[PDB]
Design an enzyme around this catalytic site. Sequence first.
Site, mmCIF file in Angstrom:
data_model
loop_
_atom_site.group_PDB
_atom_site.id
_atom_site.type_symbol
_atom_site.label_atom_id
_atom_site.label_comp_id
_atom_site.label_asym_id
_atom_site.label_seq_id
_atom_site.Cartn_x
_atom_site.Cartn_y
_atom_site.Cartn_z
ATOM 1 N N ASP A 142 0.888 -1.179 0.000
ATOM 2 C CA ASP A 142 0.000 0.000 0.000
ATOM 3 C C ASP A 142 0.922 1.224 0.000
ATOM 4 O O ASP A 142 1.608 1.488 0.963
ATOM 5 C CB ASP A 142 -0.987 -0.058 1.175
ATOM 6 C CG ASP A 142 -2.083 0.979 1.076
ATOM 7 O OD1 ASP A 142 -1.979 1.902 0.248
ATOM 8 O OD2 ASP A 142 -3.111 0.850 1.802
ATOM 9 N N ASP A 153 -3.931 6.837 -3.613
ATOM 10 C CA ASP A 153 -3.976 5.732 -2.676
ATOM 11 C C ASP A 153 -4.406 4.471 -3.400
ATOM 12 O O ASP A 153 -5.515 4.380 -3.855
ATOM 13 C CB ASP A 153 -4.886 6.057 -1.498
ATOM 14 C CG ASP A 153 -4.536 5.197 -0.257
ATOM 15 O OD1 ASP A 153 -3.931 4.075 -0.368
ATOM 16 O OD2 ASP A 153 -4.941 5.589 0.792
ATOM 17 N N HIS A 222 -12.698 5.833 1.631
ATOM 18 C CA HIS A 222 -12.708 7.185 2.229
ATOM 19 C C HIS A 222 -12.514 8.243 1.182
ATOM 20 O O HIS A 222 -11.955 7.999 0.120
ATOM 21 C CB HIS A 222 -11.670 7.343 3.355
ATOM 22 C CG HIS A 222 -10.313 6.919 2.956
ATOM 23 N ND1 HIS A 222 -9.403 7.769 2.355
ATOM 24 C CD2 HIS A 222 -9.722 5.703 2.997
ATOM 25 C CE1 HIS A 222 -8.314 7.081 2.036
ATOM 26 N NE2 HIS A 222 -8.485 5.835 2.423
ATOM 27 N N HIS A 230 -7.249 10.892 4.443
ATOM 28 C CA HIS A 230 -8.542 10.440 4.871
ATOM 29 C C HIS A 230 -9.336 11.687 5.253
ATOM 30 O O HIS A 230 -9.165 12.257 6.321
ATOM 31 C CB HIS A 230 -8.425 9.430 6.051
ATOM 32 C CG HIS A 230 -9.671 8.612 6.280
ATOM 33 N ND1 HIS A 230 -10.921 9.180 6.456
ATOM 34 C CD2 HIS A 230 -9.847 7.273 6.401
ATOM 35 C CE1 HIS A 230 -11.807 8.223 6.664
ATOM 36 N NE2 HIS A 230 -11.182 7.056 6.634
ATOM 37 N N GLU A 255 -11.408 0.816 -1.331
ATOM 38 C CA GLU A 255 -10.575 -0.302 -0.876
ATOM 39 C C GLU A 255 -11.450 -1.377 -0.266
ATOM 40 O O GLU A 255 -12.497 -1.082 0.295
ATOM 41 C CB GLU A 255 -9.454 0.112 0.070
ATOM 42 C CG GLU A 255 -9.785 0.546 1.502
ATOM 43 C CD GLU A 255 -8.523 1.022 2.228
ATOM 44 O OE1 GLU A 255 -7.430 0.794 1.652
ATOM 45 O OE2 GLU A 255 -8.565 1.616 3.355
ATOM 46 N N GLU A 350 -7.174 -1.878 -3.787
ATOM 47 C CA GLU A 350 -7.604 -0.483 -3.694
ATOM 48 C C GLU A 350 -7.235 0.326 -4.962
ATOM 49 O O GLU A 350 -6.122 0.185 -5.534
ATOM 50 C CB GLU A 350 -7.000 0.161 -2.464
ATOM 51 C CG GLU A 350 -7.285 1.670 -2.327
ATOM 52 C CD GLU A 350 -6.485 2.245 -1.194
ATOM 53 O OE1 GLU A 350 -5.254 1.851 -1.088
ATOM 54 O OE2 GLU A 350 -7.029 3.040 -0.414
HETATM 55 C C1 LIG Z 1 -4.050 3.900 7.375
HETATM 56 C C2 LIG Z 1 -4.714 3.060 6.234
HETATM 57 O O1 LIG Z 1 -3.674 2.438 5.429
HETATM 58 C C3 LIG Z 1 -5.657 2.041 6.870
HETATM 59 C C4 LIG Z 1 -6.819 2.673 7.662
HETATM 60 C C5 LIG Z 1 -7.758 3.521 6.790
HETATM 61 O O2 LIG Z 1 -8.594 4.329 7.619
HETATM 62 C C6 LIG Z 1 -9.861 3.740 7.962
HETATM 63 O O3 LIG Z 1 -10.172 2.731 7.344
HETATM 64 N N1 LIG Z 1 -10.530 4.377 8.942
HETATM 65 C C7 LIG Z 1 -11.788 3.968 9.553
HETATM 66 C C8 LIG Z 1 -12.820 5.100 9.478
HETATM 67 C C9 LIG Z 1 -11.521 3.510 10.995
HETATM 68 C C10 LIG Z 1 -6.990 4.332 5.816
HETATM 69 N N2 LIG Z 1 -7.367 5.367 5.034
HETATM 70 N N3 LIG Z 1 -6.266 5.700 4.243
HETATM 71 N N4 LIG Z 1 -5.168 4.892 4.567
HETATM 72 C C11 LIG Z 1 -3.957 5.275 3.802
HETATM 73 C C12 LIG Z 1 -2.936 5.778 4.833
HETATM 74 C C13 LIG Z 1 -3.276 6.766 5.778
HETATM 75 C C14 LIG Z 1 -2.316 7.216 6.744
HETATM 76 C C15 LIG Z 1 -1.051 6.594 6.746
HETATM 77 O O4 LIG Z 1 -0.089 6.897 7.672
HETATM 78 C C16 LIG Z 1 -0.556 7.577 8.832
HETATM 79 C C17 LIG Z 1 -0.767 5.602 5.857
HETATM 80 C C18 LIG Z 1 -1.692 5.163 4.894
HETATM 81 C C19 LIG Z 1 -5.565 4.070 5.511
HETATM 82 CO CO LIG Z 2 -3.987 2.587 0.860
#
Ligand SMILES: *C[C@@]1(O)CC[C@@H](OC(=O)NC(C)C)c2nnn(Cc3ccc(OC)cc3)c21
Ligand SMILES: [Co+2]
Length: 369
Positions: A142, A153, A222, A230, A255, A350
Amino acid sequence: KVQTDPPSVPICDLYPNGVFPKGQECEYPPTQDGRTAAWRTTSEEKKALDQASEEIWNDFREAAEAHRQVRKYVMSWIKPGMTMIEICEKLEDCSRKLIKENGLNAGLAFPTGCSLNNCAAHYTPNAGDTTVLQYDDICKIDFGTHISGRIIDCAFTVTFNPKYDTLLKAVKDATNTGIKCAGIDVRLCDVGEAIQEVMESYEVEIDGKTYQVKPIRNLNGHSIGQYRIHAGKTVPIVKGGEATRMEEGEVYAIETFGSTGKGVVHDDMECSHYMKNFDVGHVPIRLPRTKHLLNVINENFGTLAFCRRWLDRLGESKYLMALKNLCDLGIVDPYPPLCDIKGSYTAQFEHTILLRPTCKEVVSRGDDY
Ligand SMILES: *C[C@@]1(O)CC[C@@H](OC(=O)NC(C)C)c2nnn(Cc3ccc(OC)cc3)c21
Ligand SMILES: [Co+2]
Ligand SMILES: [Cl-]
Protein backbone atom coordinates in the site's frame (compact mmCIF):
# COMPACT_ATOMS: atom_id res chain seq x y z
CA LYS A 1 11.69 10.26 -23.78
CA VAL A 2 11.04 6.51 -23.14
CA GLN A 3 11.09 4.88 -19.67
CA THR A 4 14.25 3.01 -18.67
CA ASP A 5 14.44 -0.44 -17.16
CA PRO A 6 14.75 -0.32 -14.19
CA PRO A 7 12.56 2.85 -14.29
CA SER A 8 14.39 6.12 -13.62
CA VAL A 9 12.79 8.78 -15.91
CA PRO A 10 10.31 11.12 -14.15
CA ILE A 11 6.78 10.81 -15.35
CA CYS A 12 6.86 14.62 -16.16
CA ASP A 13 9.69 13.94 -18.72
CA LEU A 14 7.74 11.27 -20.53
CA TYR A 15 4.85 13.65 -21.20
CA PRO A 16 6.66 16.81 -22.31
CA ASN A 17 3.43 18.88 -23.01
CA GLY A 18 2.26 18.21 -19.46
CA VAL A 19 -0.93 16.30 -20.21
CA PHE A 20 -0.97 13.04 -18.32
CA PRO A 21 -2.92 9.95 -19.40
CA LYS A 22 -6.46 9.51 -18.15
CA GLY A 23 -7.38 6.50 -16.06
CA GLN A 24 -10.37 4.24 -16.84
CA GLU A 25 -13.40 6.41 -17.62
CA CYS A 26 -16.82 5.09 -16.73
CA GLU A 27 -20.46 6.16 -17.11
CA TYR A 28 -22.09 6.53 -13.71
CA PRO A 29 -24.55 3.86 -12.58
CA PRO A 30 -28.25 4.44 -13.37
CA THR A 31 -30.36 6.03 -10.59
CA GLN A 32 -32.11 3.53 -8.32
CA ASP A 33 -35.56 4.14 -9.83
CA GLY A 34 -33.97 3.36 -13.24
CA ARG A 35 -32.92 6.57 -15.13
CA THR A 36 -29.59 6.79 -17.12
CA ALA A 37 -26.61 9.17 -16.37
CA ALA A 38 -25.04 9.26 -19.90
CA TRP A 39 -26.25 12.89 -20.26
CA ARG A 40 -23.42 14.02 -17.99
CA THR A 41 -20.97 12.90 -20.63
CA THR A 42 -22.30 15.25 -23.34
CA SER A 43 -23.46 18.20 -21.15
CA GLU A 44 -21.82 21.60 -21.79
CA GLU A 45 -22.43 22.60 -18.19
CA LYS A 46 -20.67 19.47 -16.94
CA LYS A 47 -17.90 19.67 -19.55
CA ALA A 48 -17.26 23.32 -18.52
CA LEU A 49 -17.09 22.38 -14.83
CA ASP A 50 -14.80 19.45 -15.58
CA GLN A 51 -12.48 21.68 -17.58
CA ALA A 52 -12.38 24.18 -14.68
CA SER A 53 -10.77 21.45 -12.62
CA GLU A 54 -8.52 20.05 -15.39
CA GLU A 55 -5.21 20.98 -13.78
CA ILE A 56 -6.31 19.08 -10.64
CA TRP A 57 -7.34 15.94 -12.50
CA ASN A 58 -4.06 16.24 -14.42
CA ASP A 59 -2.05 16.27 -11.11
CA PHE A 60 -3.81 13.06 -10.02
CA ARG A 61 -3.05 11.43 -13.37
CA GLU A 62 0.64 12.26 -13.14
CA ALA A 63 0.71 10.73 -9.59
CA ALA A 64 -1.25 7.71 -10.91
CA GLU A 65 1.18 7.05 -13.75
CA ALA A 66 4.09 7.12 -11.30
CA HIS A 67 2.09 4.60 -9.11
CA ARG A 68 1.48 2.25 -12.15
CA GLN A 69 5.16 2.28 -13.20
CA VAL A 70 6.50 1.82 -9.63
CA ARG A 71 4.13 -1.13 -8.86
CA LYS A 72 4.94 -2.89 -12.17
CA TYR A 73 8.67 -2.64 -11.31
CA VAL A 74 8.03 -3.94 -7.68
CA MET A 75 6.05 -6.99 -9.00
CA SER A 76 9.08 -7.88 -11.16
CA TRP A 77 11.57 -8.28 -8.29
CA ILE A 78 9.68 -8.73 -4.99
CA LYS A 79 10.66 -12.23 -3.71
CA PRO A 80 10.87 -14.16 -0.49
CA GLY A 81 14.31 -13.79 1.14
CA MET A 82 14.32 -10.00 0.80
CA THR A 83 14.04 -8.08 4.03
CA MET A 84 11.05 -5.84 4.50
CA ILE A 85 13.46 -2.84 4.77
CA GLU A 86 15.03 -3.75 1.44
CA ILE A 87 11.70 -4.08 -0.31
CA CYS A 88 10.46 -0.65 1.05
CA GLU A 89 13.72 1.17 0.23
CA LYS A 90 13.82 -0.24 -3.31
CA LEU A 91 10.15 0.76 -3.88
CA GLU A 92 10.57 4.23 -2.34
CA ASP A 93 13.79 5.03 -4.24
CA CYS A 94 11.91 4.37 -7.50
CA SER A 95 8.87 6.30 -6.42
CA ARG A 96 10.99 9.39 -5.50
CA LYS A 97 12.58 9.33 -8.97
CA LEU A 98 9.34 8.83 -11.03
CA ILE A 99 7.37 11.38 -9.07
CA LYS A 100 10.38 13.83 -9.25
CA GLU A 101 10.22 14.52 -5.58
CA ASN A 102 10.35 18.28 -4.85
CA GLY A 103 9.47 19.14 -1.22
CA LEU A 104 5.77 19.39 -0.66
CA ASN A 105 5.16 19.99 -4.40
CA ALA A 106 5.60 16.33 -5.46
CA GLY A 107 6.56 13.28 -3.44
CA LEU A 108 5.51 10.29 -1.42
CA ALA A 109 2.09 10.68 0.15
CA PHE A 110 2.54 8.07 2.92
CA PRO A 111 4.92 5.30 3.98
CA THR A 112 5.05 1.96 2.14
CA GLY A 113 2.66 -0.49 3.86
CA CYS A 114 3.88 -4.03 3.47
CA SER A 115 1.66 -5.64 6.11
CA LEU A 116 1.98 -9.47 6.51
CA ASN A 117 -0.44 -12.30 7.08
CA ASN A 118 -2.93 -11.41 9.79
CA CYS A 119 -1.70 -7.81 9.73
CA ALA A 120 -3.73 -5.84 7.22
CA ALA A 121 -2.40 -2.25 7.36
CA HIS A 122 0.01 0.28 8.78
CA TYR A 123 3.10 -1.93 8.97
CA THR A 124 6.31 -0.63 7.59
CA PRO A 125 9.59 -1.56 9.13
CA ASN A 126 11.49 0.78 11.51
CA ALA A 127 15.32 0.73 11.63
CA GLY A 128 16.77 -2.53 12.83
CA ASP A 129 13.68 -4.56 11.77
CA THR A 130 15.12 -7.98 10.66
CA THR A 131 11.83 -9.29 9.19
CA VAL A 132 12.29 -11.26 5.95
CA LEU A 133 9.51 -11.93 3.45
CA GLN A 134 8.68 -15.67 3.31
CA TYR A 135 7.19 -17.98 0.65
CA ASP A 136 3.91 -18.41 2.59
CA ASP A 137 3.50 -14.79 3.39
CA ILE A 138 0.54 -12.71 2.12
CA CYS A 139 1.87 -9.11 1.83
CA LYS A 140 -0.25 -5.92 1.30
CA ILE A 141 1.73 -3.37 -0.68
CA ASP A 142 0.00 0.00 0.00
CA PHE A 143 1.96 3.06 -1.19
CA GLY A 144 0.94 6.60 -2.17
CA THR A 145 2.21 9.28 -4.51
CA HIS A 146 1.23 12.91 -4.91
CA ILE A 147 1.52 16.06 -7.06
CA SER A 148 0.57 19.24 -5.24
CA GLY A 149 -1.11 17.30 -2.47
CA ARG A 150 -3.28 15.35 -4.99
CA ILE A 151 -3.03 11.87 -3.55
CA ILE A 152 -3.11 8.40 -5.17
CA ASP A 153 -3.98 5.73 -2.68
CA CYS A 154 -3.69 2.37 -4.42
CA ALA A 155 -2.85 -1.09 -3.07
CA PHE A 156 -2.48 -4.69 -4.07
CA THR A 157 -1.59 -8.02 -2.44
CA VAL A 158 1.59 -10.08 -3.23
CA THR A 159 1.76 -13.84 -2.64
CA PHE A 160 3.94 -16.74 -3.83
CA ASN A 161 1.89 -19.74 -2.74
CA PRO A 162 -1.11 -20.41 -4.98
CA LYS A 163 -3.16 -21.48 -1.88
CA TYR A 164 -4.19 -17.80 -1.48
CA ASP A 165 -5.29 -17.32 -5.15
CA THR A 166 -9.07 -17.60 -4.35
CA LEU A 167 -8.82 -15.11 -1.44
CA LEU A 168 -7.06 -12.58 -3.73
CA LYS A 169 -9.84 -13.07 -6.34
CA ALA A 170 -12.55 -12.47 -3.80
CA VAL A 171 -11.11 -9.20 -2.67
CA LYS A 172 -10.39 -8.02 -6.12
CA ASP A 173 -13.91 -8.79 -7.26
CA ALA A 174 -15.32 -7.07 -4.15
CA THR A 175 -13.24 -3.97 -4.75
CA ASN A 176 -14.22 -3.82 -8.45
CA THR A 177 -17.84 -4.20 -7.51
CA GLY A 178 -17.42 -1.19 -5.08
CA ILE A 179 -15.86 0.86 -7.81
CA LYS A 180 -18.82 -0.01 -10.16
CA CYS A 181 -21.44 0.87 -7.55
CA ALA A 182 -19.80 4.21 -6.75
CA GLY A 183 -21.02 7.47 -8.15
CA ILE A 184 -22.68 10.76 -7.44
CA ASP A 185 -25.67 10.67 -5.09
CA VAL A 186 -24.91 7.01 -4.28
CA ARG A 187 -25.28 6.23 -0.53
CA LEU A 188 -21.96 5.27 1.07
CA CYS A 189 -23.73 2.39 2.82
CA ASP A 190 -24.96 1.12 -0.58
CA VAL A 191 -21.31 0.78 -1.83
CA GLY A 192 -20.54 -1.18 1.36
CA GLU A 193 -23.44 -3.54 0.97
CA ALA A 194 -22.46 -4.36 -2.63
CA ILE A 195 -18.84 -5.12 -1.47
CA GLN A 196 -20.07 -7.35 1.31
CA GLU A 197 -22.49 -9.35 -0.80
CA VAL A 198 -19.72 -10.20 -3.26
CA MET A 199 -17.10 -10.86 -0.69
CA GLU A 200 -19.19 -13.41 1.12
CA SER A 201 -20.21 -15.25 -2.09
CA TYR A 202 -16.59 -16.64 -1.93
CA GLU A 203 -15.55 -19.74 0.02
CA VAL A 204 -11.80 -20.55 0.15
CA GLU A 205 -9.71 -23.57 1.22
CA ILE A 206 -6.23 -22.85 2.73
CA ASP A 207 -4.17 -25.79 4.09
CA GLY A 208 -7.21 -28.07 4.54
CA LYS A 209 -9.38 -25.56 6.30
CA THR A 210 -12.37 -23.81 4.70
CA TYR A 211 -13.51 -20.26 5.27
CA GLN A 212 -16.11 -17.82 4.03
CA VAL A 213 -14.20 -14.54 3.20
CA LYS A 214 -15.19 -11.64 5.53
CA PRO A 215 -14.76 -7.98 4.86
CA ILE A 216 -12.77 -6.28 7.63
CA ARG A 217 -15.50 -4.18 9.25
CA ASN A 218 -13.19 -1.37 10.49
CA LEU A 219 -11.07 -0.75 7.48
CA ASN A 220 -12.86 1.53 5.06
CA GLY A 221 -12.62 3.39 1.77
CA HIS A 222 -12.71 7.18 2.23
CA SER A 223 -12.77 10.58 0.61
CA ILE A 224 -9.48 12.19 -0.17
CA GLY A 225 -8.67 15.91 0.22
CA GLN A 226 -5.66 18.06 -0.68
CA TYR A 227 -2.76 16.94 1.56
CA ARG A 228 -5.42 14.89 3.44
CA ILE A 229 -5.33 11.12 2.96
CA HIS A 230 -8.54 10.44 4.87
CA ALA A 231 -10.88 13.40 4.52
CA GLY A 232 -13.83 12.27 6.65
CA LYS A 233 -16.33 10.60 4.30
CA THR A 234 -15.87 6.85 5.11
CA VAL A 235 -17.17 3.85 3.15
CA PRO A 236 -17.92 0.58 5.01
CA ILE A 237 -17.09 -2.82 3.73
CA VAL A 238 -19.90 -4.38 5.79
CA LYS A 239 -23.65 -3.61 5.88
CA GLY A 240 -24.54 -0.97 8.54
CA GLY A 241 -23.35 2.63 8.56
CA GLU A 242 -24.58 6.17 7.84
CA ALA A 243 -26.73 6.48 4.69
CA THR A 244 -24.95 9.75 3.63
CA ARG A 245 -23.90 10.38 0.04
CA MET A 246 -21.14 10.83 -2.49
CA GLU A 247 -21.08 14.27 -4.11
CA GLU A 248 -19.81 15.67 -7.45
CA GLY A 249 -16.09 16.53 -7.61
CA GLU A 250 -15.02 14.34 -4.69
CA VAL A 251 -12.21 11.79 -4.78
CA TYR A 252 -12.38 8.39 -3.14
CA ALA A 253 -10.06 5.66 -2.15
CA ILE A 254 -12.21 2.56 -2.82
CA GLU A 255 -10.57 -0.30 -0.88
CA THR A 256 -11.66 -3.69 0.39
CA PHE A 257 -9.99 -5.95 2.85
CA GLY A 258 -10.83 -9.61 3.03
CA SER A 259 -10.08 -11.83 6.00
CA THR A 260 -10.14 -15.52 7.08
CA GLY A 261 -10.19 -14.30 10.74
CA LYS A 262 -12.74 -12.36 12.75
CA GLY A 263 -13.03 -9.64 10.16
CA VAL A 264 -11.97 -6.95 12.70
CA VAL A 265 -8.49 -5.42 13.27
CA HIS A 266 -6.84 -4.29 16.56
CA ASP A 267 -3.58 -2.37 17.18
CA ASP A 268 -0.55 -4.64 17.54
CA MET A 269 3.30 -4.45 17.21
CA GLU A 270 5.57 -1.45 17.31
CA CYS A 271 4.40 1.82 15.67
CA SER A 272 6.10 3.07 12.48
CA HIS A 273 3.49 5.44 10.95
CA TYR A 274 2.65 8.96 12.21
CA MET A 275 0.87 12.02 10.83
CA LYS A 276 0.12 15.54 12.03
CA ASN A 277 -3.53 16.09 13.05
CA PHE A 278 -5.02 18.00 10.17
CA ASP A 279 -7.12 20.14 12.54
CA VAL A 280 -4.51 21.23 15.02
CA GLY A 281 -3.39 24.75 14.36
CA HIS A 282 -0.15 26.39 15.32
CA VAL A 283 1.16 25.52 18.76
CA PRO A 284 4.26 27.28 20.12
CA ILE A 285 6.81 24.82 21.56
CA ARG A 286 9.82 25.86 23.64
CA LEU A 287 11.20 22.38 24.49
CA PRO A 288 14.11 22.31 22.07
CA ARG A 289 14.14 18.80 20.75
CA THR A 290 10.37 18.68 20.46
CA LYS A 291 10.42 22.15 18.68
CA HIS A 292 13.07 20.94 16.31
CA LEU A 293 11.25 17.79 15.44
CA LEU A 294 7.93 19.57 14.83
CA ASN A 295 9.83 22.02 12.48
CA VAL A 296 11.31 19.03 10.62
CA ILE A 297 7.83 17.56 10.23
CA ASN A 298 6.26 20.89 9.09
CA GLU A 299 9.10 21.36 6.54
CA ASN A 300 9.23 17.87 5.14
CA PHE A 301 5.71 16.38 5.49
CA GLY A 302 3.14 18.98 6.50
CA THR A 303 -0.10 17.00 6.91
CA LEU A 304 1.10 14.03 4.93
CA ALA A 305 1.96 10.78 6.74
CA PHE A 306 5.50 9.80 7.56
CA CYS A 307 7.38 7.01 9.31
CA ARG A 308 10.42 6.58 11.53
CA ARG A 309 12.66 5.58 8.65
CA TRP A 310 11.87 8.85 6.92
CA LEU A 311 13.09 10.79 9.97
CA ASP A 312 16.21 8.71 10.12
CA ARG A 313 17.05 9.49 6.48
CA LEU A 314 16.82 13.20 7.21
CA GLY A 315 19.60 12.79 9.75
CA GLU A 316 17.44 12.91 12.86
CA SER A 317 18.43 10.62 15.77
CA LYS A 318 17.34 9.97 19.38
CA TYR A 319 14.00 11.58 18.63
CA LEU A 320 11.57 9.04 20.12
CA MET A 321 10.90 11.08 23.24
CA ALA A 322 10.26 14.29 21.21
CA LEU A 323 7.92 12.26 18.88
CA LYS A 324 6.03 10.93 21.89
CA ASN A 325 5.71 14.45 23.19
CA LEU A 326 4.10 15.58 19.95
CA CYS A 327 1.68 12.63 20.10
CA ASP A 328 0.85 13.36 23.71
CA LEU A 329 0.13 17.03 22.91
CA GLY A 330 -2.22 15.89 20.15
CA ILE A 331 -0.20 17.60 17.37
CA VAL A 332 0.85 14.25 15.83
CA ASP A 333 -1.13 11.02 15.83
CA PRO A 334 0.40 7.52 15.81
CA TYR A 335 -1.03 4.78 13.50
CA PRO A 336 0.15 1.40 14.73
CA PRO A 337 -0.17 -1.79 12.66
CA LEU A 338 -3.73 -3.08 12.45
CA CYS A 339 -4.11 -6.85 12.64
CA ASP A 340 -6.82 -9.52 12.71
CA ILE A 341 -6.43 -12.55 14.96
CA LYS A 342 -3.28 -14.77 15.07
CA GLY A 343 -3.47 -17.32 12.30
CA SER A 344 -5.76 -15.36 9.98
CA TYR A 345 -4.95 -14.19 6.47
CA THR A 346 -5.86 -10.76 5.12
CA ALA A 347 -5.84 -9.34 1.53
CA GLN A 348 -6.40 -5.89 0.04
CA PHE A 349 -7.09 -4.18 -3.27
CA GLU A 350 -7.60 -0.48 -3.69
CA HIS A 351 -8.00 2.21 -6.33
CA THR A 352 -8.45 5.95 -6.32
CA ILE A 353 -11.46 7.28 -8.20
CA LEU A 354 -12.43 10.82 -9.32
CA LEU A 355 -16.11 11.81 -9.43
CA ARG A 356 -15.80 14.23 -12.27
CA PRO A 357 -18.89 16.19 -13.51
CA THR A 358 -18.86 14.22 -16.76
CA CYS A 359 -17.76 10.71 -15.85
CA LYS A 360 -16.27 8.47 -13.11
CA GLU A 361 -12.51 8.00 -13.62
CA VAL A 362 -10.62 5.07 -11.97
CA VAL A 363 -7.52 7.14 -12.18
CA SER A 364 -5.17 4.48 -10.78
CA ARG A 365 -6.44 1.55 -12.97
CA GLY A 366 -3.66 -0.33 -14.77
CA ASP A 367 -3.43 -3.43 -17.01
CA ASP A 368 -2.44 -5.20 -13.84
CA TYR A 369 -5.53 -4.45 -11.66
C1 LIG B 1 -4.05 3.90 7.37
C2 LIG B 1 -4.71 3.06 6.23
O1 LIG B 1 -3.67 2.44 5.43
C3 LIG B 1 -5.66 2.04 6.87
C4 LIG B 1 -6.82 2.67 7.66
C5 LIG B 1 -7.76 3.52 6.79
O2 LIG B 1 -8.59 4.33 7.62
C6 LIG B 1 -9.86 3.74 7.96
O3 LIG B 1 -10.17 2.73 7.34
N1 LIG B 1 -10.53 4.38 8.94
C7 LIG B 1 -11.79 3.97 9.55
C8 LIG B 1 -12.82 5.10 9.48
C9 LIG B 1 -11.52 3.51 11.00
C10 LIG B 1 -6.99 4.33 5.82
N2 LIG B 1 -7.37 5.37 5.03
N3 LIG B 1 -6.27 5.70 4.24
N4 LIG B 1 -5.17 4.89 4.57
C11 LIG B 1 -3.96 5.27 3.80
C12 LIG B 1 -2.94 5.78 4.83
C13 LIG B 1 -3.28 6.77 5.78
C14 LIG B 1 -2.32 7.22 6.74
C15 LIG B 1 -1.05 6.59 6.75
O4 LIG B 1 -0.09 6.90 7.67
C16 LIG B 1 -0.56 7.58 8.83
C17 LIG B 1 -0.77 5.60 5.86
C18 LIG B 1 -1.69 5.16 4.89
C19 LIG B 1 -5.56 4.07 5.51
CO1 LIG C 1 -3.99 2.59 0.86
CL1 LIG D 1 -3.95 -25.00 0.63
